[PDB]
Amino acid sequence: SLHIYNWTDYIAPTTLKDFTKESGIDVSYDVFDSNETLEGKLVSGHSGYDIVVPSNNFLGKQIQAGAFQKLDKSKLPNWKNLDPALLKQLEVSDPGNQYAVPYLWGTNGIGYNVAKVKEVLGDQPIDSWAILFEPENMKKLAKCGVAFMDSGDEMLPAALNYLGLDPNTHDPKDYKKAEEVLTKVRPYVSYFHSSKYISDLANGNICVAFGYSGDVFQAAARAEEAGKGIDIQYVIPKEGANLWFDLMAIPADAKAADNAYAFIDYLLRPEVIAKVSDYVGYANAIPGARPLMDKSVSDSEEVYPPQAVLDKLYVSAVLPAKVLRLQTRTWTRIK
């Protein structure tokens, strides 16, 4: 049997049977609905899993701990289906792409109620982080409600990048500037919170939010299924944004490596990862998949932004503990 550990509801309906029918490998497929759960089992040394799907942040930090084993690429002949630019991006967390295979990816960006933005901003294009970081815009959006998330680890890199600084900088002086930018708009923010924006966007209670792509899509789908006309749009701004990956990796402890390579090689197939994207609605790293996919997904700039944007995405590097404390420190003064 092949043991897999992934997020709940994060796979296409037919994927596992399709896989088992073609390789004859039986799968034991378990799920988690929180990051902490997976990381906990991985830090202990023995999660009986052959495949786990960690975040590129978690994996970057744990490589050094030896939580994962190097991929024998001779058993991944579909590796050549992967997009080289996205892979190059991924090296920030996994230098040489030694341990990890892209599964799905997303961004952070701005989620917003289209009609409500128009009432206070008119037809102004919503395509810059200036919408959140310039007093001229925030001052007007404050009327409808602007939600910011609640940790500097995501919001501070955004502002640094907005300013054109290195989102992964270690320099306290760069942090000061981004701090300055954030504090000038602080007054116009209704709240700082992990997740409140999802329902507030969906319900019609706020008009704009700093958010992650999958969370904004959830808000949008919830809005649509409510039937009250609330239209939630997502945008990756022209200056770039964070790029985050969920990954397939083999734990160090892993028993069935060969079974596992078979599953991984399978998901690198265009027609296979296409169905996963169609179902979950996130981008994948296999350009072969694009034409095989639902248009609402591959033709949507919410998930596949134009090239000028793709060029400006940034992967979070592993920051020294000192820098993580600096973010936190700066984030507190801001609130």
CSV table of C-alpha atoms in Angstrom, one decimal:
chain,number,residue,atom,x,y,z
A,1,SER,CA,0.0,0.0,0.0
A,2,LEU,CA,1.1,3.6,-0.6
A,3,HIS,CA,0.5,6.0,2.3
A,4,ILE,CA,-0.3,9.6,1.4
A,5,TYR,CA,-1.0,12.6,3.7
A,6,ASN,CA,-2.6,15.7,2.1
A,7,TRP,CA,-5.1,18.5,3.0
A,8,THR,CA,-8.8,17.5,3.0
A,9,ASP,CA,-10.6,17.9,-0.3
A,10,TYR,CA,-7.4,18.8,-2.2
A,11,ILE,CA,-7.4,16.3,-5.0
A,12,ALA,CA,-9.7,15.6,-8.0
A,13,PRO,CA,-12.5,13.0,-7.5
A,14,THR,CA,-11.0,10.4,-9.9
A,15,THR,CA,-7.4,10.9,-9.3
A,16,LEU,CA,-6.7,8.0,-6.9
A,17,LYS,CA,-8.8,5.3,-8.6
A,18,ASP,CA,-7.3,6.5,-12.0
A,19,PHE,CA,-3.9,6.0,-10.5
A,20,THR,CA,-4.6,2.7,-8.9
A,21,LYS,CA,-6.2,1.4,-12.0
A,22,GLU,CA,-3.1,2.1,-14.1
A,23,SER,CA,-0.2,1.2,-11.8
A,24,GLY,CA,-1.9,-1.4,-9.6
A,25,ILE,CA,-0.6,0.4,-6.5
A,26,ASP,CA,-3.1,0.5,-3.6
A,27,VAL,CA,-3.2,3.8,-1.8
A,28,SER,CA,-3.9,4.6,1.8
A,29,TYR,CA,-4.9,8.3,1.6
A,30,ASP,CA,-5.3,10.3,4.9
A,31,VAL,CA,-6.1,14.0,5.3
A,32,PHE,CA,-5.4,16.9,7.6
A,33,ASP,CA,-7.3,20.2,7.9
A,34,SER,CA,-4.4,22.1,9.5
A,35,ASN,CA,-0.7,22.7,8.9
A,36,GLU,CA,0.2,22.1,12.6
A,37,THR,CA,-1.0,18.5,12.4
A,38,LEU,CA,1.3,17.6,9.5
A,39,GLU,CA,4.3,19.4,10.8
A,40,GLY,CA,3.9,17.8,14.2
A,41,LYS,CA,4.1,14.3,12.7
A,42,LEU,CA,7.0,15.3,10.5
A,43,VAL,CA,9.1,16.8,13.4
A,44,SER,CA,8.7,13.5,15.5
A,45,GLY,CA,10.6,11.5,12.9
A,46,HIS,CA,7.9,8.9,12.3
A,47,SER,CA,4.8,9.7,10.3
A,48,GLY,CA,4.3,6.4,8.5
A,49,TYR,CA,3.7,8.3,5.2
A,50,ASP,CA,5.4,7.8,1.9
A,51,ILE,CA,4.1,11.1,0.5
A,52,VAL,CA,3.2,14.2,2.4
A,53,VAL,CA,2.2,17.6,1.0
A,54,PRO,CA,3.9,20.4,3.0
A,55,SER,CA,4.1,24.1,2.3
A,56,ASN,CA,7.3,25.4,0.6
A,57,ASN,CA,7.9,27.4,3.8
A,58,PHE,CA,7.7,24.4,6.1
A,59,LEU,CA,9.9,22.3,3.7
A,60,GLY,CA,12.5,25.0,3.3
A,61,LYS,CA,13.0,25.1,7.1
A,62,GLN,CA,12.9,21.4,7.6
A,63,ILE,CA,15.3,20.3,4.8
A,64,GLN,CA,18.2,21.1,7.2
A,65,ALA,CA,16.5,18.9,9.8
A,66,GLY,CA,16.7,16.0,7.4
A,67,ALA,CA,12.9,15.5,7.5
A,68,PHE,CA,12.8,14.6,3.9
A,69,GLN,CA,14.9,12.6,1.5
A,70,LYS,CA,16.4,13.6,-1.8
A,71,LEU,CA,14.5,12.7,-4.9
A,72,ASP,CA,16.0,10.2,-7.2
A,73,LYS,CA,15.1,12.0,-10.4
A,74,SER,CA,15.8,8.9,-12.6
A,75,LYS,CA,12.4,7.7,-11.2
A,76,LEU,CA,10.6,10.9,-12.2
A,77,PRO,CA,10.9,10.9,-16.0
A,78,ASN,CA,8.0,13.4,-16.2
A,79,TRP,CA,10.1,16.0,-14.4
A,80,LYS,CA,10.5,17.6,-17.8
A,81,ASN,CA,6.8,18.5,-17.8
A,82,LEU,CA,7.4,21.0,-15.0
A,83,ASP,CA,7.7,24.8,-15.8
A,84,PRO,CA,11.3,25.8,-15.4
A,85,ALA,CA,10.6,29.3,-14.2
A,86,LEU,CA,8.3,28.2,-11.4
A,87,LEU,CA,10.9,25.6,-10.5
A,88,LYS,CA,13.6,28.3,-10.5
A,89,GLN,CA,11.4,30.3,-8.1
A,90,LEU,CA,11.0,27.2,-5.9
A,91,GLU,CA,14.7,27.0,-5.4
A,92,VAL,CA,14.5,29.8,-3.0
A,93,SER,CA,13.0,27.1,-0.6
A,94,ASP,CA,14.6,24.0,-2.0
A,95,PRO,CA,18.0,24.8,-3.7
A,96,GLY,CA,18.6,22.6,-6.7
A,97,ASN,CA,15.0,21.3,-6.4
A,98,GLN,CA,16.4,18.3,-4.5
A,99,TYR,CA,13.5,17.3,-2.4
A,100,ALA,CA,10.2,18.7,-3.6
A,101,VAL,CA,7.8,18.5,-6.6
A,102,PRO,CA,5.2,21.2,-7.1
A,103,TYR,CA,1.6,20.1,-6.5
A,104,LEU,CA,-0.4,23.3,-6.6
A,105,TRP,CA,0.4,27.0,-6.1
A,106,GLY,CA,-1.1,30.4,-5.2
A,107,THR,CA,-0.5,33.9,-4.3
A,108,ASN,CA,-1.4,36.7,-1.9
A,109,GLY,CA,-3.0,39.7,-3.4
A,110,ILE,CA,-6.1,41.8,-2.9
A,111,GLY,CA,-9.7,40.5,-2.7
A,112,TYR,CA,-12.4,43.0,-3.2
A,113,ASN,CA,-16.1,43.6,-3.7
A,114,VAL,CA,-16.2,45.1,-7.2
A,115,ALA,CA,-19.4,47.2,-6.9
A,116,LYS,CA,-18.4,48.5,-3.5
A,117,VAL,CA,-15.0,49.6,-4.7
A,118,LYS,CA,-16.7,51.5,-7.5
A,119,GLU,CA,-18.9,53.5,-5.1
A,120,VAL,CA,-15.9,55.1,-3.4
A,121,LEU,CA,-13.1,54.7,-6.1
A,122,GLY,CA,-15.0,55.0,-9.3
A,123,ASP,CA,-13.6,53.1,-12.3
A,124,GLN,CA,-10.1,53.4,-10.8
A,125,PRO,CA,-8.1,50.3,-11.8
A,126,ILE,CA,-7.4,47.9,-8.8
A,127,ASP,CA,-4.1,46.6,-9.9
A,128,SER,CA,-1.6,47.9,-7.4
A,129,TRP,CA,-0.7,47.4,-3.8
A,130,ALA,CA,-1.1,51.2,-3.6
A,131,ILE,CA,-4.8,50.4,-3.1
A,132,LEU,CA,-3.8,49.1,0.4
A,133,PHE,CA,-0.6,51.0,1.0
A,134,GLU,CA,-1.3,54.6,-0.1
A,135,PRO,CA,-3.3,56.9,2.2
A,136,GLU,CA,-4.9,58.5,-0.9
A,137,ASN,CA,-6.7,55.2,-1.6
A,138,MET,CA,-7.1,53.8,1.9
A,139,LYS,CA,-8.6,57.1,3.1
A,140,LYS,CA,-11.5,56.5,0.7
A,141,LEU,CA,-11.8,52.8,1.2
A,142,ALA,CA,-11.9,53.2,4.9
A,143,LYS,CA,-15.6,54.0,4.5
A,144,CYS,CA,-16.4,50.5,3.2
A,145,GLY,CA,-14.0,48.6,5.4
A,146,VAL,CA,-10.5,47.4,4.7
A,147,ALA,CA,-9.3,44.2,6.3
A,148,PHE,CA,-5.6,43.5,6.9
A,149,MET,CA,-4.3,40.1,7.9
A,150,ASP,CA,-2.6,39.7,11.3
A,151,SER,CA,1.1,38.8,10.9
A,152,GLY,CA,4.1,40.8,9.7
A,153,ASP,CA,5.5,37.7,8.0
A,154,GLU,CA,3.1,38.2,5.1
A,155,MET,CA,2.1,41.9,5.2
A,156,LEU,CA,5.7,43.2,5.6
A,157,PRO,CA,7.2,41.4,2.7
A,158,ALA,CA,4.3,42.8,0.6
A,159,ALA,CA,5.1,46.4,1.6
A,160,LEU,CA,8.8,45.9,1.1
A,161,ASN,CA,8.2,44.6,-2.4
A,162,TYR,CA,5.7,47.4,-3.0
A,163,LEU,CA,8.5,49.9,-2.2
A,164,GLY,CA,10.7,47.9,-4.5
A,165,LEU,CA,12.9,46.6,-1.6
A,166,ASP,CA,13.8,43.0,-1.1
A,167,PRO,CA,10.8,41.2,0.4
A,168,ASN,CA,13.3,38.8,2.0
A,169,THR,CA,15.7,41.5,3.2
A,170,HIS,CA,17.4,41.0,6.6
A,171,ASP,CA,18.2,44.8,6.9
A,172,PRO,CA,16.4,46.6,9.8
A,173,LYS,CA,16.6,49.8,7.7
A,174,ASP,CA,14.5,48.3,5.0
A,175,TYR,CA,12.0,47.2,7.7
A,176,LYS,CA,11.8,50.8,9.0
A,177,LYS,CA,10.6,52.1,5.6
A,178,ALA,CA,8.0,49.4,5.2
A,179,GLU,CA,7.0,50.1,8.7
A,180,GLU,CA,6.5,53.8,7.8
A,181,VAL,CA,4.3,52.9,4.8
A,182,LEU,CA,2.1,50.6,6.9
A,183,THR,CA,1.7,53.0,9.8
A,184,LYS,CA,0.5,55.8,7.4
A,185,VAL,CA,-2.5,53.6,6.5
A,186,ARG,CA,-3.1,51.9,9.9
A,187,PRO,CA,-5.7,54.5,10.7
A,188,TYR,CA,-7.9,53.3,7.7
A,189,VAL,CA,-7.9,49.6,8.6
A,190,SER,CA,-11.0,48.1,10.3
A,191,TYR,CA,-9.1,45.2,11.8
A,192,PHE,CA,-6.1,42.9,11.6
A,193,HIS,CA,-7.2,39.3,11.6
A,194,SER,CA,-6.3,35.8,10.2
A,195,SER,CA,-9.4,34.8,8.5
A,196,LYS,CA,-12.3,37.2,9.3
A,197,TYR,CA,-12.0,38.8,5.8
A,198,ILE,CA,-13.3,35.6,4.2
A,199,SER,CA,-16.8,35.9,5.6
A,200,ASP,CA,-16.8,39.7,5.7
A,201,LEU,CA,-16.0,39.7,1.9
A,202,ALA,CA,-18.6,37.1,1.2
A,203,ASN,CA,-21.3,38.7,3.3
A,204,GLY,CA,-20.8,42.2,1.9
A,205,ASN,CA,-19.4,43.7,5.1
A,206,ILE,CA,-16.0,45.0,3.9
A,207,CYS,CA,-15.0,46.1,0.4
A,208,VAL,CA,-11.3,45.2,0.3
A,209,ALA,CA,-8.9,42.8,1.9
A,210,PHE,CA,-5.3,41.8,1.9
A,211,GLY,CA,-5.7,38.0,1.3
A,212,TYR,CA,-4.4,34.7,0.0
A,213,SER,CA,-5.7,33.5,-3.3
A,214,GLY,CA,-7.5,30.3,-2.1
A,215,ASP,CA,-9.1,32.2,0.8
A,216,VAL,CA,-10.4,34.9,-1.6
A,217,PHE,CA,-11.8,32.2,-3.9
A,218,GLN,CA,-13.6,30.7,-1.0
A,219,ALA,CA,-15.1,34.0,-0.2
A,220,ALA,CA,-16.1,34.4,-3.9
A,221,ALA,CA,-17.8,30.9,-4.1
A,222,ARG,CA,-19.6,31.5,-0.8
A,223,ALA,CA,-20.8,34.9,-2.2
A,224,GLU,CA,-22.0,33.2,-5.4
A,225,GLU,CA,-23.9,30.4,-3.6
A,226,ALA,CA,-25.6,33.0,-1.3
A,227,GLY,CA,-27.4,34.4,-4.3
A,228,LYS,CA,-27.4,38.0,-3.2
A,229,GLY,CA,-25.3,39.4,-6.0
A,230,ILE,CA,-22.1,40.0,-4.1
A,231,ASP,CA,-19.2,39.9,-6.6
A,232,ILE,CA,-15.8,39.1,-5.2
A,233,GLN,CA,-12.8,39.5,-7.5
A,234,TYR,CA,-9.1,38.8,-6.7
A,235,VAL,CA,-6.0,40.5,-8.1
A,236,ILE,CA,-2.3,39.9,-8.1
A,237,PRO,CA,-0.9,43.4,-8.3
A,238,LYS,CA,1.4,44.7,-11.0
A,239,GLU,CA,4.3,45.1,-8.5
A,240,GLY,CA,4.3,41.3,-7.8
A,241,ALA,CA,3.2,39.3,-4.8
A,242,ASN,CA,4.0,36.3,-2.7
A,243,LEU,CA,4.1,32.9,-4.5
A,244,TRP,CA,3.5,29.9,-2.3
A,245,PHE,CA,3.5,26.2,-3.2
A,246,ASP,CA,2.1,23.0,-1.8
A,247,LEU,CA,4.6,20.3,-2.6
A,248,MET,CA,4.9,16.6,-2.8
A,249,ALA,CA,7.8,15.2,-0.8
A,250,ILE,CA,9.0,11.8,0.6
A,251,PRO,CA,9.8,11.7,4.3
A,252,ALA,CA,13.2,10.5,5.4
A,253,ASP,CA,11.6,7.5,7.2
A,254,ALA,CA,9.6,6.5,4.1
A,255,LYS,CA,9.2,2.7,3.4
A,256,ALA,CA,7.7,2.6,-0.1
A,257,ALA,CA,9.9,4.9,-2.1
A,258,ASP,CA,9.2,3.3,-5.5
A,259,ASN,CA,5.4,3.3,-5.0
A,260,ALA,CA,5.8,7.0,-4.1
A,261,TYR,CA,7.8,7.9,-7.2
A,262,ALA,CA,5.1,6.3,-9.3
A,263,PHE,CA,2.4,8.5,-7.7
A,264,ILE,CA,4.6,11.6,-8.1
A,265,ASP,CA,5.4,10.9,-11.7
A,266,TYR,CA,1.7,10.4,-12.2
A,267,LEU,CA,0.7,13.8,-10.9
A,268,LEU,CA,3.3,15.3,-13.2
A,269,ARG,CA,1.1,14.1,-16.1
A,270,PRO,CA,-0.7,17.0,-17.8
A,271,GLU,CA,-4.1,15.3,-18.1
A,272,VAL,CA,-3.8,14.3,-14.4
A,273,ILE,CA,-2.8,17.5,-12.8
A,274,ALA,CA,-5.3,19.3,-15.1
A,275,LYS,CA,-8.2,17.6,-13.3
A,276,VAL,CA,-6.8,18.4,-9.9
A,277,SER,CA,-6.7,22.1,-10.9
A,278,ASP,CA,-10.2,21.9,-12.3
A,279,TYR,CA,-11.5,20.5,-9.2
A,280,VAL,CA,-9.7,22.7,-6.6
A,281,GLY,CA,-9.3,25.7,-8.8
A,282,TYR,CA,-5.6,26.5,-8.1
A,283,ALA,CA,-2.8,26.7,-10.6
A,284,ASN,CA,-0.3,23.8,-11.2
A,285,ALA,CA,3.2,23.9,-12.5
A,286,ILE,CA,2.6,21.9,-15.7
A,287,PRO,CA,2.1,24.1,-18.8
A,288,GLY,CA,1.0,21.0,-20.7
A,289,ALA,CA,-2.0,21.0,-18.4
A,290,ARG,CA,-3.3,24.5,-19.4
A,291,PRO,CA,-5.2,23.5,-22.6
A,292,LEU,CA,-6.7,20.5,-20.9
A,293,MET,CA,-8.2,22.6,-18.1
A,294,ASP,CA,-11.5,24.3,-17.5
A,295,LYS,CA,-11.4,27.8,-18.9
A,296,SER,CA,-12.8,29.4,-15.7
A,297,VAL,CA,-9.5,28.3,-14.3
A,298,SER,CA,-6.8,28.5,-17.0
A,299,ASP,CA,-8.1,31.7,-18.5
A,300,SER,CA,-8.6,33.5,-15.2
A,301,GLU,CA,-5.9,36.0,-14.4
A,302,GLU,CA,-6.8,35.5,-10.7
A,303,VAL,CA,-4.9,32.2,-11.0
A,304,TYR,CA,-2.8,32.5,-14.1
A,305,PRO,CA,-1.7,36.2,-14.3
A,306,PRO,CA,0.1,37.7,-17.3
A,307,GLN,CA,3.8,37.3,-17.7
A,308,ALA,CA,4.8,40.8,-16.6
A,309,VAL,CA,3.1,39.8,-13.3
A,310,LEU,CA,4.6,36.2,-13.0
A,311,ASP,CA,8.0,37.8,-13.3
A,312,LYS,CA,7.5,39.8,-10.1
A,313,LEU,CA,6.3,37.0,-7.7
A,314,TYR,CA,8.6,36.3,-4.9
A,315,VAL,CA,9.1,33.1,-2.8
A,316,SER,CA,9.7,33.6,0.9
A,317,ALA,CA,13.2,32.7,1.8
A,318,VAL,CA,14.1,30.9,5.1
A,319,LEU,CA,14.7,33.9,7.3
A,320,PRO,CA,17.1,33.8,10.3
A,321,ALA,CA,15.3,33.7,13.7
A,322,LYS,CA,16.5,37.3,14.3
A,323,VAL,CA,14.6,38.5,11.3
A,324,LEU,CA,11.4,36.7,12.2
A,325,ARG,CA,11.5,38.5,15.6
A,326,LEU,CA,12.1,41.8,13.8
A,327,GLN,CA,9.0,41.3,11.7
A,328,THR,CA,6.9,40.5,14.8
A,329,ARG,CA,8.4,43.5,16.7
A,330,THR,CA,7.6,45.8,13.8
A,331,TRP,CA,4.1,44.4,13.3
A,332,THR,CA,3.3,45.1,16.9
A,333,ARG,CA,4.3,48.7,16.8
A,334,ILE,CA,2.1,49.0,13.7
A,335,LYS,CA,-1.0,47.8,15.5
